């Protein structure tokens, strides 16, 4: 599996309107989230590729760490990263070993799905999506083979927030995570 990490934008789905982007301080009463959330592609359930490990209140927002564990997703992503002229076209410029950069390129964002502000049961949070159709602010998704390397790609996480996050991630045995229910996005039509 892979690790993913980054700040998230917090998004709710209205009836009528398309997308509502919350201020993260609107949901910080509900952090830390240590219960695993499904990680999906672009809010398509049926595309679970893994599981969050922790979301934490850090400096200006909400930092997520996750594991990407779906073998069908990983195999499909690797095939595309290696062989698809189209997946490869927008990257200047590719190592070989291109998977981590192809993921970062096409799934650059993390969206934390939350119930609307107006609410008071149900969980607050539903899933985290790797997002391509989202905003170019608020979130940058970094994919890597260990969590230390991932958390290293960020400048605004303090020494103690970093230690806190890694300690927590070190306690998660990946093989204890349940199978994600994944089908290709194209199979959902």
* Residues in touch with ligand NJQ (CB under 6 A): 41-42, 44, 73, 76-77, 80-81, 83-84, 86-87, 102-103, 106-107, 132-133, 184-189
Catalytic residue among 111, 113, 114, 129: 111
Q: Which is nearer to its own copies, 31 or 91 (CB)?
A: 91
- From its own copies, ligand NJQ, none, which one binds at residue 74 (CB under 5 to 8 Å depending on kind)? none
Q: Exposed/middle/buried for 49, CB within 10 Å: 0-12, 13-18, 19+? A: buried
111 is catalytic: yes
Query: Do residues 189 and 63 touch, judged by C-beta distance below 8 A?
Result: no
What stretches of 74-175 adopt beta strand conformation (E)? 109-114, 125-131, 142-144
104 is catalytic: no
Binding region for its own copies (CB under 8 A): 41-42, 44, 46-47, 79-80, 83-87, 89-90, 105-106, 108, 132-133, 182-183, 185-189
Q: For residue 127, give Cα distances in angstroms to 39, 73, 159.
A: 6, 17, 28
127 is catalytic: yes
Catalytic residue among 12, 43, 113, 114: 43
Q: For residue 188, give Cα distances in angstroms to 42, 110, 140, 143.
A: 12, 21, 26, 25
The CB density around residue 183, as the number of other CB atoms within 10 Å, is 14
Q: Which is nearer to its own copies, 100 or 115 (CB)?
A: 100
- Residue positions annotated with a catalytic role: 43, 111, 127
């Amino acid at each position: 599996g892979l690790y993913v990490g980054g700040f998230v934008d917090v998004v709710s789905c209205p009836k009528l309107e398309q997308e509502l982007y919350l201020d993260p301080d609107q949901v910080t009463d509900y952090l830390p989230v240590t219960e695993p959330l499904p990680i999906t592609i672009e809010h398509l359930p049926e595309t679970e590729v893994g599981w969050t490990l922790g979301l934490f209140q850090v400096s200006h927002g909400i930092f997520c760490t996750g594991a990407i564990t779906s073998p069908a997703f990983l195999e499909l992503a690797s095939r595309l990263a290696d062989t698809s002229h189209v997946a490869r076209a927008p990257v200047k410029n590719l190592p070989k070993e291109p998977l981590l950069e192809i993921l970062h390129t096409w799934l650059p964002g993390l969206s934390l799905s939350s119930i609307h502000p107006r609410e008071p049961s149900g969980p607050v949070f539903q899933h985290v999506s790797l997002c391509a159709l989202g905003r170019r602010r608020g979130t940058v998704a970094v994919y890597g083979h260990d969590a230390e390397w991932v958390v290293s790609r960020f400048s605004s996480v303090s020494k103690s927030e970093r230690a806190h996050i890694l300690q927590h991630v070190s306690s998660c045995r990946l093989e204890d995570l349940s199978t994600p229910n994944f089908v290709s996005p194209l199979e959902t039509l």
